[PDB]
Amino acid sequence: GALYTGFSILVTLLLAGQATTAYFLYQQQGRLDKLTVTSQNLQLENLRMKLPKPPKPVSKMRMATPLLMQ
């Protein structure tokens, strides 16, 4: 009876395929976790684009002036 021999190969191939689905499913969760961080870091930038900062007192820089060649 080789019918049970046939079923044996199918189950092993079926479980081998399930390993591939698990590996790629775990692989994609790395992208989503990385994409989530980038998306929310970009949201933070937007939030700061609409908020100014209270200015500090104005102090002028100083310079030097050259002279004239007679």
- Measure the N-to-C terminal CA separation of the chain; round to a whole number of Å: 117
Binders in 11-50 for other proteins, by CB under 8 A? 11-13, 15-16, 19-20, 23, 36, 40-41, 43-44, 46-48
d(CA 5, CA 44) in angstroms, rounded, equals 60
- Phi, psi (deg, nearest 5) at residue 62: -115, 155
Q: Cα separation of 33 and 35, whole Å?
A: 5
Where along the sequence are the contacts to a copy of itself (CB under 8 A)?
3-4, 7, 10-11, 14-15, 17-18, 21-22, 24-25, 28-29, 31-32, 35-36, 38-39, 42-43, 45-46
The residues of the shown chain that bind other proteins, judged by CB under 8 A, are 2-3, 5-6, 9-13, 15-16, 19-20, 23, 36, 40-41, 43-44, 46-48, 51-70
